[PDB]
Amino acid sequence: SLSKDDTAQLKITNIEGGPTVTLYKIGEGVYNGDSFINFKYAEGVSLTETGPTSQEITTIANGINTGKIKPFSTENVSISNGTATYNARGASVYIALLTGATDGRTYNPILLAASYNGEGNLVTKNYLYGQTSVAKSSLPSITKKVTGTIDDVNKKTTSLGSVLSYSLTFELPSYTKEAVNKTVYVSDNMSEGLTFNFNSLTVEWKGKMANITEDGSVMVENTKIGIAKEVNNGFNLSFIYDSLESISPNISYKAVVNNKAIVGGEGNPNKAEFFYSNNPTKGNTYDNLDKKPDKGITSKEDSKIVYTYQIAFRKVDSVSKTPLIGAIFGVYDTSNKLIDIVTTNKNGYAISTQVSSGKYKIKELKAPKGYSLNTETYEITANWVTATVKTSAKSTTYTSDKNKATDNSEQVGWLKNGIFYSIDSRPTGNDVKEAYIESTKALTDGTTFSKSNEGSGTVLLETDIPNTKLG
Numbered sequence: 001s002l003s004k005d006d007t008a009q010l011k012i013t014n015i016e017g018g019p020t021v022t023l024y025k026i027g028e029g030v031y032n033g034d035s036f037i038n039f040k041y042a043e044g045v046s047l048t049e050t051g052p053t054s055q056e057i058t059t060i061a062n063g064i065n066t067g068k069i070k071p072f073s074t075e076n077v078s079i080s081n082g083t084a085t086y087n088a089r090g091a092s093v094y095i096a097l098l099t100g101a102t103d104g105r106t107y108n109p110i111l112l113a114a115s116y117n118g119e120g121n122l123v124t125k126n127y128l129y130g131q132t133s134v135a136k137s138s139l140p141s142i143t144k145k146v147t148g149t150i151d152d153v154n155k156k157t158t159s160l161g162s163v164l165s166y167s168l169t170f171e172l173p174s175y176t177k178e179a180v181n182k183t184v185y186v187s188d189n190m191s192e193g194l195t196f197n198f199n200s201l202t203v204e205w206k207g208k209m210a211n212i213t214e215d216g217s218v219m220v221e222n223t224k225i226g227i228a229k230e231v232n233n234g235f236n237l238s239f240i241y242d243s244l245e246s247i248s249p250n251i252s253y254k255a256v257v258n259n260k261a262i263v264g265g266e267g268n269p270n271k272a273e274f275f276y277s278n279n280p281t282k283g284n285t286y287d288n289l290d291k292k293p294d295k296g297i298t299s300k301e302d303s304k305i306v307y308t309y310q311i312a313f314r315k316v317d318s319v320s321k322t323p324l325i326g327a328i329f330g331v332y333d334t335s336n337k338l339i340d341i342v343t344t345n346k347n348g349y350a351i352s353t354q355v356s357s358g359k360y361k362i363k364e365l366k367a368p369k370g371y372s373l374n375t376e377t378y379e380i381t382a383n384w385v386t387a388t389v390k391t392s393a394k395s396t397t398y399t400s401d402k403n404k405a406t407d408n409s410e411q412v413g414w415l416k417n418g419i420f421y422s423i424d425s426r427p428t429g430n431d432v433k434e435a436y437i438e439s440t441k442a443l444t445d446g447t448t449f450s451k452s453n454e455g456s457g458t459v460l461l462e463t464d465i466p467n468t469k470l471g
């Protein structure tokens with residue numbers, strides 16, 4: 001006794017991430033209502049009734065999503081506790097698509113059928129069997145790391161002119177061979193206080209370094225695995241999924257801390273993004289390198305924040321404690337390398353360029369007029385904990401001419417194509433020029449300094465610096 005109105009359960013297990021499940025009927029059961037004849041398939045559907053192949057299943061899904069294949073009906077199926085169940089009316093064949101998982105996972109298509117000839121059995125030459133299928137998905141990821149920084153407890157810190165080395169690794173989506181959207185697309189953009197170096201971009205794949213040519217082609221073993229382009233203060237890099245052989249490339253690049261580096265809480269972040277398809281049988285692979293795609297495309301992301309601080313102090317008369325203008329000070333790192341030169345303002349105050357966590361030294365180069373030179377070195381420790389001052393407040397002026405250095409001062413770093421590098425980040429090239437500080441501008445009169453929270457950005461010396469009046 002067949003009907004029709006015979007029911008059987010079509011079931012999907014291993015549903016993670018809470019996707020939408022849609023069933024598209026691609027095969028109608030044809031009855032005489034008491035005898036089962038065969039399946040009638042939607043126009044454009046092609047499959048092997050003996051055992052449909054992955055190629056065929058994905059192909060059908062592609063057609064459904066373009067509209068080339070019109071299913072006989074579309075069903076929305078609820079989920080719970082990792083499974084979905086649908087009560088089919090009569091022998092019938094469906095493609096299930098799982099889309100929009102909130103954890104970012106991407107799923108393969110599923111073929112489900114209710115059949116009188118055994119679970120899933122499509123050959124038609126009493127009892128209506130259902131079908132249970134285990135859903136299959138992949139969860140991409142992207143992880144960004146930075147080195148070249150100085151650890152301040154759990155904060156990575158840096159200084160003006162430091163070169164920072166970033167690295168990306170990622171886990172690929174798993175796409176079936178016939179998928180129409182195999183987007184594999186990587187982006188980063190550096191915040192404005194870091195100057196991205198596109199020429200530093202490297203790609204390793206299968207333990208081999210890529211050569212990136214002039215037009216952006218990422219070449220390994222005479223194979224183009226992707227194309228890179230410099231965009232704003234960063235890059236877009238679109239890979240060719242099939243060329244990767246399911247092995248993820250590893251991406252590295254550098255940036256150098258510039259004078260716009262933010263001090264304190266906000267820090268200096270990047271934002272690495274990995275775009276892929278979470279509905280790979282819909283649309284087309286995205287590879288436009290001018291502009292990253294909008295989110296059948298979704299993404300994972302990662303960011304590293306790097307911090308800087310600034311050193312401040314006040315210059316006063318040793319007896320009256322009244323503030324002294326125009327005192328010139330050097331600020332040195334722990335090994336006595338000159339970091340910066342500052343001049344005190346009307347209110348006695350000076351502030352350094354951006355520094356990493358660490359110990360520094362403040363030493364006078366020129367007394368204020370009417371005062372004897374203070375020959376003492378003043379030490380100060382800079383870190384998240386000591387940077388409790390918030391100021392309402394530089395762009396240093398360099399020369400490569402040693403004889404134009406203020407106060408006959410030493411070299412503070414290097415210049416290459418307009419960019420400042422610290423001594424410890426001395427870059428390569430035959431046109432790398434010595435950098436000296438040519439002049440110093442005092443801080444604007446009426447700049448305030450208020451004691452405040454950790455990470456405010458400014459480390460103000462505990463005791464003001466005395467000068468002894470000549471008289």
Ligand SMILES: [Ca+2]
Pocket residue numbers: 079080081082083084085
């Ligand atoms: Ca369920």
